[PDB]
Every structure is written in C-alpha cells, then in structure tokens.
Amino acid sequence: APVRSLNCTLRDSQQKSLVMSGPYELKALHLQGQDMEQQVVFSMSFVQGEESNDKIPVALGLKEKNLYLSCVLKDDKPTLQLESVDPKNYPKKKMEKRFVFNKIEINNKLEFESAQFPNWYISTSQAENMPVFLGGTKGGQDITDFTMQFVSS
C-alpha cells in the first residue's frame, strides 16, 4: 500500500513496442495502429534503493498481474526473467534486489540498469520478434534506451 506506482508503456529508441510472448516472456516488435493493443502496460513502482537526480530505483511489474521483471543468474549469465509473486505481498517499497532497476534519464530517453548486476541493462534487438533481455553492452548494436508513455488501465 505504501508504494507509489505509475502505469506506462515503454518503446525502445527504434520505436519498437513490447508485447507478451509466452507466459513469462516479452518480445519487442514494430507495432502500430489498433494492433497496438497487444502492447504491455507496466506498473512502475518507486522502491527503496540509492536514489539520485539521475538514478531512480524502480520495480517493473505488469499492470494487473502478479508478474515482475527480475534479474537472476541462469547459466552463470545475468538474465532477465518474468517472475510470478504472491499477489498479496506485492508491490512493496522494499522489493528484493532482483526486482530493482535504476531508471536513468539520458537525453529525454531512459535506461534501466539492473541494481543486482551493475552495468547490465534491459535490452532489445535491432530485429523484431526477438525477446527482451539483459545486456552488459551499452552502445553496441543492441538497444538499451527507451521512451516512456504515461497511461492507465
């Protein structure tokens, strides 16, 4: 209850929208028009962590589902996953580190760094219908910057 949330959608800098692939996967694809319906709405929560003018810790859950983006090791590799949680205990202000991302504002765009694995960012691929992932390479050919749209649902 003592958590401030905010509904929104994310679009990568290449203007791709995010959509639920499997029950636990997000995909980024060029979506437009009415078809923009298969687009995911997040509830962004301002949680506890080391706040700053340029870094704001948030948790990213799907709007009315008990599903959260979390960063864990899977094969020794930092990996982004959708994690289901107790729908009674979430969201909360002191989320577990896995669930926390630092939101960074860069040139009217956003980057989400994993608080658990520093310098690892939520990333999308140049190509479409590719899954959203955790990447340890800023710049490069993979996209780590986003734009956010305020919404509601």
Coordinates of C-alpha atoms in Angstrom, one line a residue, residues 6-13 18 26 42-47 54-61 69-71 78-80 97-106 108-124 132-138 143-150:
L6 CA 2.7 4.6 -12.2
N7 CA 1.2 2.9 -15.3
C8 CA 3.1 3.3 -18.5
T9 CA 4.3 1.7 -21.7
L10 CA 7.9 1.5 -22.9
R11 CA 9.0 1.8 -26.5
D12 CA 12.7 1.3 -27.5
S13 CA 14.6 4.0 -29.3
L18 CA 6.9 -4.6 -26.1
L26 CA 8.4 -10.2 -23.5
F42 CA 3.6 -1.8 -16.8
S43 CA 3.1 -0.6 -13.3
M44 CA 6.3 1.2 -12.4
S45 CA 7.0 1.3 -8.6
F46 CA 9.3 3.7 -6.9
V47 CA 11.0 1.4 -4.3
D54 CA 19.9 10.9 -12.4
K55 CA 19.1 7.4 -10.8
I56 CA 15.8 6.3 -9.5
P57 CA 15.3 2.7 -8.3
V58 CA 12.1 1.2 -9.7
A59 CA 10.4 -2.2 -10.0
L60 CA 8.6 -3.1 -13.2
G61 CA 5.5 -5.3 -13.0
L69 CA 10.8 -8.3 -14.2
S70 CA 13.7 -9.7 -12.3
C71 CA 17.4 -10.3 -12.9
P78 CA 22.9 -12.3 -15.8
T79 CA 19.4 -12.9 -17.3
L80 CA 16.1 -11.0 -17.4
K97 CA 17.3 -6.5 -5.3
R98 CA 16.4 -8.9 -8.2
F99 CA 13.4 -6.8 -8.9
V100 CA 15.1 -3.4 -8.8
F101 CA 16.3 -1.5 -11.8
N102 CA 17.9 2.0 -11.7
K103 CA 16.0 4.2 -14.1
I104 CA 18.4 6.7 -15.7
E105 CA 17.3 9.6 -17.9
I106 CA 19.7 10.1 -20.8
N108 CA 15.0 12.5 -22.9
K109 CA 15.3 8.7 -23.0
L110 CA 15.5 6.1 -20.3
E111 CA 17.9 3.2 -19.4
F112 CA 17.1 0.6 -16.9
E113 CA 20.2 -0.7 -15.2
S114 CA 20.0 -3.9 -13.1
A115 CA 20.6 -2.9 -9.4
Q116 CA 21.8 -6.6 -8.9
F117 CA 24.2 -6.7 -11.9
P118 CA 25.7 -3.2 -12.4
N119 CA 26.2 -2.1 -16.0
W120 CA 23.7 -4.6 -17.2
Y121 CA 20.7 -3.1 -18.9
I122 CA 17.3 -4.2 -20.2
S123 CA 17.9 -4.6 -23.9
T124 CA 16.1 -5.2 -27.2
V132 CA 13.7 -8.5 -24.4
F133 CA 17.0 -9.4 -22.5
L134 CA 19.6 -8.3 -20.0
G135 CA 22.7 -7.0 -21.8
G136 CA 26.1 -5.9 -20.5
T137 CA 26.9 -3.9 -23.5
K138 CA 25.8 -0.2 -23.8
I143 CA 19.2 -1.2 -27.9
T144 CA 19.3 -0.1 -24.2
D145 CA 17.5 3.3 -24.4
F146 CA 13.7 3.7 -24.2
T147 CA 11.0 6.3 -24.2
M148 CA 8.1 6.1 -21.8
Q149 CA 4.4 6.9 -22.3
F150 CA 2.1 7.6 -19.4

